[PDB]
Enzyme design. Structure first.
Site, short mmCIF file in Angstrom:
data_model
loop_
_atom_site.label_atom_id
_atom_site.label_comp_id
_atom_site.label_asym_id
_atom_site.label_seq_id
_atom_site.Cartn_x
_atom_site.Cartn_y
_atom_site.Cartn_z
N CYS A 172 -2.34 -5.54 -2.55
CA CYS A 172 -2.57 -7.09 -2.47
C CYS A 172 -3.40 -7.19 -1.32
CB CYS A 172 -1.54 -7.65 -2.09
SG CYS A 172 -1.49 -9.62 -1.89
N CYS A 202 -2.71 -9.34 1.66
CA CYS A 202 -1.73 -8.50 2.29
C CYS A 202 -2.73 -7.76 3.35
CB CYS A 202 -0.76 -7.95 1.62
SG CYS A 202 0.42 -8.88 0.88
#
Length: 102
Positions: A28, A31
């Protein structure tokens, strides 16, 4: 000093100053942008807050229990209770401002 935690040790690490849990996944993008922020804050707020990371790919049970419907999500725990859920990417100053509140 960000500790990777799983369901078996989650209870232990969470109950211990506020404990910050970064729910993330290595694929991600947002992230990965957050990772360095959490790492830096573990040093800048050392002695004030505790930081941990939960990989949601490997801990779907933790994610479901705390309603982590979107990542990145940063959760703040105080005395074993979840007190803040910070959804979405935020800069260092924003995370700090939230932790400061408890």
């Amino acid at each position: 000093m960000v500790k990777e935690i799983n369901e078996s040790i989650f209870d232990e690490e969470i109950k211990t100053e506020p404990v910050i849990v970064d729910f993330w996944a290595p694929w991600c993008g947002p992230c990965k942008m957050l990772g360095p922020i959490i790492d830096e804050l573990s040093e800048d707020l050392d002695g004030k807050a505790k930081f941990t990371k939960v990989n949601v790919d490997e801990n779907p049970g933790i994610a479901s229990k705390f309603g982590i419907a979107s990542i990145p999500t940063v959760m703040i725990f105080k005395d074993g209770n979840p007190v803040e859920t910070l959804v979405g990417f935020r800069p260092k100053q924003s995370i700090t401002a939230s932790i400061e509140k408890h």
